[PDB]
Amino acid sequence: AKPPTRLFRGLNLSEEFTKGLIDQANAMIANTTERLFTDHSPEAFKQIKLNDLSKMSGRTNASTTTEIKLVKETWDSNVIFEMLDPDGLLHSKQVGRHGEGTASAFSVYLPEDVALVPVKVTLDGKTQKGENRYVFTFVAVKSPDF
Ligand SMILES: NC(=O)c1cccnc1
């Protein structure tokens, strides 16, 4: 199928929530993701699923795009989730354009045994409201199997 291996999704999130989201991601990046990446930790996997930073957990048809500019220039999201899926662990179905005012997209399902593991939070410019725009980069990883 050769699904796309990088997808983006944006949300408009409040200032206060976004600040807490940054802090939570960076706490996991330094402190939880390491256990998953180095020691293939089941507990660390579970904590990442439960935290669900991206709000993707359980969604079977969340809309995404391969083009980050489409997110920025359609919804002017202040928070953009960049999902790296080299193993095609997501179920990514192309939803083509169908008529006026539409755009191509990928509809995604995040299985319970796939975690979007946070790896970075990066400042990426400003929204049209003058908000700082943040990109949260994740890698999709399979539950460890011992
Ligand atoms: N159609 C959408 O809701 C959407 C949102 C963010 C990124 N890509 C698509």
Tokens 């795009």 -> residue: 65
Q: CB of 82 within 8 A of CB of 138?
A: yes
- Please check whether residue 8 is in contact with residue 66, taking contact to mean a CB–CB distance below 8 angstroms: yes
Residue nearest to atom 7 of ligand 1 (CA): 9
Both tokens of 119, joined, read: 């790896």
Question: How distant is the alpha carbon of residue 17 from its chain centre?
Answer: 16
* Experimental determination approach used: X-ray
**DSSP assignment of 49-75:** HHH-TTS-TT-SSEEEBS-HHHHHHHH
42: Cβ–Cβ under 8 A, 6 or more apart, which residues? 143, 144, 146
| Cβ proximity of 5 and 84 under 8 Å | yes
Q: In this structure, which residue's CA is closest to atom 5 in ligand 1?
A: 9
Residue 71: CB within 6 Å of ligand 1? yes
Q: Whose CA is nearest to atom 1 of ligand 1?
A: 63
Could you tell me if 54 and 81 are in contact, meaning their C-beta atoms sit under 8 angstroms apart?
yes
| DSSP structural state of residue 143 | P
Name the helix (H) or strand (E) containing 123: strand 114-126
Which segments of the chain does DSSP mark as H helices, in order? Answer: 15-31, 33-39, 42-51, 68-75
User: In angstroms, what is the resolution?
Assistant: 1.5
The finding on whether 106 has its CB within 6 A of some atom of ligand 1 is: no
CA of 37 to the centre of ligand 1 (A): 29
Residue pair 94/104 in contact by the 8 Å Cβ criterion = yes
Which residue is listed with tokens 């969604």? 59
Strand partners, 6: 84
Q: Are strands 105-109 and 62-64 parallel, antiparallel or unpaired?
A: antiparallel
| 68 Cβ contact partners less than 8 Å away, ≥ 6 residues apart | 8, 80, 82, 135
- Which residue type sits at 126? K
Ligand 1 touching residue 9 (CB < 6 A): yes
Q: Contact at 8 Å (CB) between 51 and 133?
A: no
127 torsion bin: left (phi>0), alpha (psi -120 to 50), beta (else): beta
Kindly report the CA angle at 110 between 105 and 116, in degrees rounded to 5? 100
Helices and strands (DSSP H and E) totals, the chain = 4, 7
Residue corresponding to tokens 């409040």: 14
72 CB less than 6 Å from ligand 1?
A: no
Parallel/antiparallel/unpaired status of strands 132-142 and 114-126: antiparallel
